[PDB]
Design an enzyme around this catalytic site. Structure first.
Site, PDB file in Angstrom:
ATOM      1  N   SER A 246       0.599  -1.220   0.107  1.00  0.00           N
ATOM      2  CA  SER A 246      -0.666  -0.220   0.471  1.00  0.00           C
ATOM      3  C   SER A 246       0.610   1.234   0.151  1.00  0.00           C
ATOM      4  CB  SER A 246      -1.008  -0.097   1.424  1.00  0.00           C
ATOM      5  OG  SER A 246      -1.680  -1.292   0.919  1.00  0.00           O
TER       6      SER A 246
HETATM    7  C1  LIG Z   1      -1.758  -2.503   1.881  1.00  0.00           C
HETATM    8  O1  LIG Z   1      -0.408  -2.431   2.590  1.00  0.00           O
HETATM    9  C2  LIG Z   1      -3.012  -3.451   2.279  1.00  0.00           C
HETATM   10  N1  LIG Z   1      -2.303  -4.543   2.274  1.00  0.00           N
HETATM   11  C3  LIG Z   1      -3.020  -5.538   2.459  1.00  0.00           C
HETATM   12  O2  LIG Z   1      -3.899  -5.584   1.737  1.00  0.00           O
HETATM   13  C4  LIG Z   1      -2.585  -6.817   3.427  1.00  0.00           C
HETATM   14  N2  LIG Z   1      -2.880  -7.918   1.833  1.00  0.00           N
HETATM   15  C5  LIG Z   1      -2.899  -7.197   4.176  1.00  0.00           C
HETATM   16  C6  LIG Z   1      -3.714  -7.261   4.779  1.00  0.00           C
HETATM   17  C7  LIG Z   1      -4.894  -7.250   6.108  1.00  0.00           C
HETATM   18  C8  LIG Z   1      -3.584  -7.890   6.719  1.00  0.00           C
HETATM   19  O3  LIG Z   1      -3.712  -8.284   7.945  1.00  0.00           O
HETATM   20  C9  LIG Z   1      -1.993  -7.962   6.897  1.00  0.00           C
HETATM   21  C10 LIG Z   1      -1.670  -7.544   4.927  1.00  0.00           C
HETATM   22  C11 LIG Z   1      -3.889  -2.405   3.019  1.00  0.00           C
HETATM   23  N3  LIG Z   1      -3.114  -1.348   4.090  1.00  0.00           N
HETATM   24  C12 LIG Z   1      -2.499  -1.471   5.246  1.00  0.00           C
HETATM   25  C13 LIG Z   1      -1.742  -0.909   6.121  1.00  0.00           C
HETATM   26  O4  LIG Z   1      -0.601  -0.756   6.417  1.00  0.00           O
HETATM   27  O5  LIG Z   1      -2.172   0.285   5.922  1.00  0.00           O
HETATM   28  C14 LIG Z   1      -3.399  -2.420   5.479  1.00  0.00           C
HETATM   29  C15 LIG Z   1      -4.150  -1.597   6.956  1.00  0.00           C
HETATM   30  C16 LIG Z   1      -2.980  -3.520   7.052  1.00  0.00           C
HETATM   31  S1  LIG Z   1      -4.676  -3.066   4.746  1.00  0.00           S
END
Ligand SMILES: *C(=O)[C@@H](NC(=O)[C@H](N)c1ccc(O)cc1)[C@@H]1N[C@@H](C(=O)O)C(C)(C)S1
Length: 515
Positions: A246
């Protein structure tokens, strides 16, 4: 032959490496190497046991070594002793024992700047980091001397020196040792507190392209030439690639705002927090939203929101921004073994690949590339070439994101840090700070799916928001405690390091009343 004219090498002084303010970081230190002519040693055998004991050698093993090398005229006794230890052996006055003055690196800051400064091999040649990358500059040219050798390996006289030893040249790094120590200390503390496997932290000057700090964990003491642990010697910031997740959403957003089709106050419907694309499901962590504005998509980090925007504008526009800011692209730093990573490309982008690109999966980048991309965004969309050496005359930057788009995205990232529900742990008291969290699931080492319990925690940002000076990336590999989200694990490190670095650089606190 009765006489034989030959040539021998005189080691040259290796160039001093300093930080940007002249603090020594790598210093050539005189050492004494002892060698012997076995044929000359054969005439003074009663002296061998005392010579062996002075070298800490067993008497028989030492005698065996000389006897089996009786044909040779050059044998190393010990390399790289201090001139104090060297003279204690020279003081025995053993016939056939000789000394030559060589050089060995001393690293005054040791483990604190080990990856960036690097390391030299047995022959005083660079093999890691700056030592390697600037080896030609640093090495200089050895001297060449004349000689007169016999069938017993004996030398008669001098009256010579055909080629004088040329010292290597001084090099000032872009690194500020003050900021380097702060970054080292805070990353180490974070690693231990989170029981993490590894981490990297890069600080860049957004105006000059200079790397002000680059630290990794684990690290090592480059003055201990015995330990030899390959994993600890890895400059992870430059050689270890990862999916940035992200943290690349601000670039997707730059593409959206440049398209003509999106403004920050425009709305995306992200209900019900998931979106099916064939057999793939895009999922948000927080799934209680319907309409979100573009700023809200970044604050909440909606994968659904950014994916829908990507379908609208096309993957090509997003690819273009990421490529232009340097993600998966050669940095031009010329460190051998530096990794470039990969930015996927297509003629026809399928929907799943479009979505994943927009939220940072399916591409691999380094921490240095990520910091450089954030620097361009912070520098009103202008990318200044990366440098690991002090920059006195700054080269022109390339405009890669329009200034208005870059400025708009900057304000959005300030809101990510300051707004309700945002990354509040990235706040820097006294200043306005901006950035974006990421959390990425690590792809399994075997075949083998995505590793269920293994994450990478990311935060990338810059400050002060009203007049950006510094960009920073914090990447922490496999935190082991209850928290693993980038906003929980990496943001507080960004806060602590930014708080110190801004003040060390005498940057005026910008959280002031309105003018
Ligand atoms: C980008 O980094 C996003 N991460 C994910 O979607 C990732 N697959 C993920 C999802 C859920 C988890 O428990 C672990 C990993 C979004 N941006 C992240 C951030 O840190 O800002 C999230 C809010 C965790 S999701």
């Amino acid at each position: 032959p009765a006489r034989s004219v030959r040539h021998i090498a005189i080691p040259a002084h290796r160039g001093l490496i300093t930080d940007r303010n002249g603090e020594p970081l790598a210093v050539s230190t005189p050492v004494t190497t002892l060698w012997a002519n076995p044929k000359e040693l054969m005439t003074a055998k009663e002296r061998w046991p005392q010579l062996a004991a002075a070298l800490g050698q067993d008497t028989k093993l030492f005698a065996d070594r000389i006897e089996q090398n009786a044909e040779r005229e050059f044998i190393y006794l010990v390399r790289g002793l201090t001139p104090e230890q060297g003279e204690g052996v020279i003081a025995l006055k053993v016939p056939g024992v000789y000394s030559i003055e060589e050089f060995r690196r001393f690293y005054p800051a040791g483990e604190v700047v080990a990856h960036a400064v690097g390391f030299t091999d047995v022959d005083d040649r660079g093999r890691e980091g700056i030592e390697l990358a600037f080896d030609e500059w640093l090495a200089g040219v050895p001297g060449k001397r004349q000689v007169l050798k016999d069938r017993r390996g004996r030398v008669i006289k001098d009256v010579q020196v055909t080629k004088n030893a040329k010292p290597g040249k001084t090099l000032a790094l872009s690194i500020d040792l003050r900021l380097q120590y702060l970054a080292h200390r805070e990353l180490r503390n974070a690693l231990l507190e989170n029981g993490a496997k590894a981490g990297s932290l890069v600080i860049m000057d957004v105006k000059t392209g200079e790397i002000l700090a680059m630290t990794n964990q684990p690290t090592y003491n480059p003055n201990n030439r015995r330990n030899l642990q390959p994993a600890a010697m890895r400059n992870r910031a430059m050689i270890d690639v990862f999916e940035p997740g992200s943290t690349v959403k601000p670039f997707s957003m730059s593409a959206a705002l440049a398209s003509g089709r999106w403004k920050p106050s425009d709305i995306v419907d992200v209900y019900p927090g998931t979106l099916q694309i064939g057999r793939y499901t895009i999922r948000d962590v927080s799934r209680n939203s319907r309409q979100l504005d573009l700023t809200g998509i970044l604050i909440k980090s909606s994968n659904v929101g950014i994916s829908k925007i990507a379908f609208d504008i096309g993957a090509e526009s997003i690819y273009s921004v990421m490529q232009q800011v340097g993600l998966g692209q050669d940095t031009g730093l010329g460190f051998p073994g530096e990794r470039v990573g990969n930015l996927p490309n297509h003629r026809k982008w399928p929907k799943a690949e479009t979505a994943t690109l927009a939220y940072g999966y399916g591409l691999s980048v380094t921490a240095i590339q990520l910091a450089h991309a954030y620097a361009a965004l912070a520098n009103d969309g202008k990318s200044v070439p990366l440098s690991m050496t002090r920059v006195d005359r700054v080269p022109d930057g390339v405009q890669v994101i329009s200034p208005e788009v870059a400025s708009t995205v900057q304000g959005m990232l300030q809101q990510v840090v300051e707004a309700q529900g945002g990354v509040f742990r990235a706040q820097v008291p006294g200043y306005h700070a901006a950035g974006k969290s990421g959390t990425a699931r690590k792809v399994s080492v075997g075949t083998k799916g995505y590793r269920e319990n293994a994450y990478r925690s990311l935060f990338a940002g810059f400050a002060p928001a009203t007049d950006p000076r510094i960009a920073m990336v914090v990447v922490i590999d496999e935190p082991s405690k209850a928290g693993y989200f980038g906003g929980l694990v990496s943001a507080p490190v960004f806060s602590k390091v930014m708080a110190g670095a801004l003040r060390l650089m005498n940057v005026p606190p910008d959280n002031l009343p309105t003018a």
